[PDB]
Amino acid sequence: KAARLFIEALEKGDPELMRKVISPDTKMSDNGRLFTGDEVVEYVKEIQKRGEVWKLVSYEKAGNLWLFLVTVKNNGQEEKWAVAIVVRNGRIKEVIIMSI
Amino acid sequence: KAARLFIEALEKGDPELMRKVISPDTKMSDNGRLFTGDEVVEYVKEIQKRGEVWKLVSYEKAGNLWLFLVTVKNNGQEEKWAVAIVVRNGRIKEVIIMSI
Ligand SMILES: [Zn+2]
Ligand SMILES: [Zn+2]
Numbered sequence: 001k002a003a004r005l006f007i008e009a010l011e012k013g014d015p016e017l018m019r020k021v022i023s024p025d026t027k028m029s030d031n032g033r034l035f036t037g038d039e040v041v042e043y044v045k046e047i048q049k050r051g052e053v054w055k056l057v058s059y060e061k062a063g064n065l066w067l068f069l070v071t072v073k074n075n076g077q078e079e080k081w082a083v084a085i086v087v088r089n090g091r092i093k094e095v096i097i098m099s100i
Numbered sequence: 101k102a103a104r105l106f107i108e109a110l111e112k113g114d115p116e117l118m119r120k121v122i123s124p125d126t127k128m129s130d131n132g133r134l135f136t137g138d139e140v141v142e143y144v145k146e147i148q149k150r151g152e153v154w155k156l157v158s159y160e161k162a163g164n165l166w167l168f169l170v171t172v173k174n175n176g177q178e179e180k181w182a183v184a185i186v187v188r189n190g191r192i193k194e195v196i197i198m199s200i
Binding site for chain 2: 027028029031032034058060061062063064065066067069080082084086093094095096098100
């Protein structure tokens, strides 16, 4: 459930949805930039502010680890990103977003 | 340490190195194919048997989560793959290998 909500929050640029699956100790690396806790919710506000369109293309899963391939669109420009998450107790604990 | 050994085992096609950082409950998904425990060591034997050349290009990290971008070469053919790992207690617990 948490994993689906994570994707929907990005795809819809919905910070309040992302708040539901984040914890204060959620750790995220966005291409080397570190964000913790509510900073992850702010990351999503920035998606919405910019008008970024995220689309899930495909994913795999092993236990509590998920790996997503997504495209991000911004100003007629489409690019591929890999997004890795660890889920525990209905919360996203760690997140990595990396440019391909 | 475990994370570096994981990469070196792939890059060098060394099953015995991979044995050092795997546990019996290590779970791996290789593009939807599930491997557990010693099956991960056998995955590396298959790399070496085939003559596959893996090269780490870049990586990021958030807590115990690592995400690697690697190229794999095989028969004059080079392709990009994303490799996500979770490390705990010096062991790889979960692994995902996904084609880009
Ligand atoms: Zn979608
Ligand atoms: Zn290397």
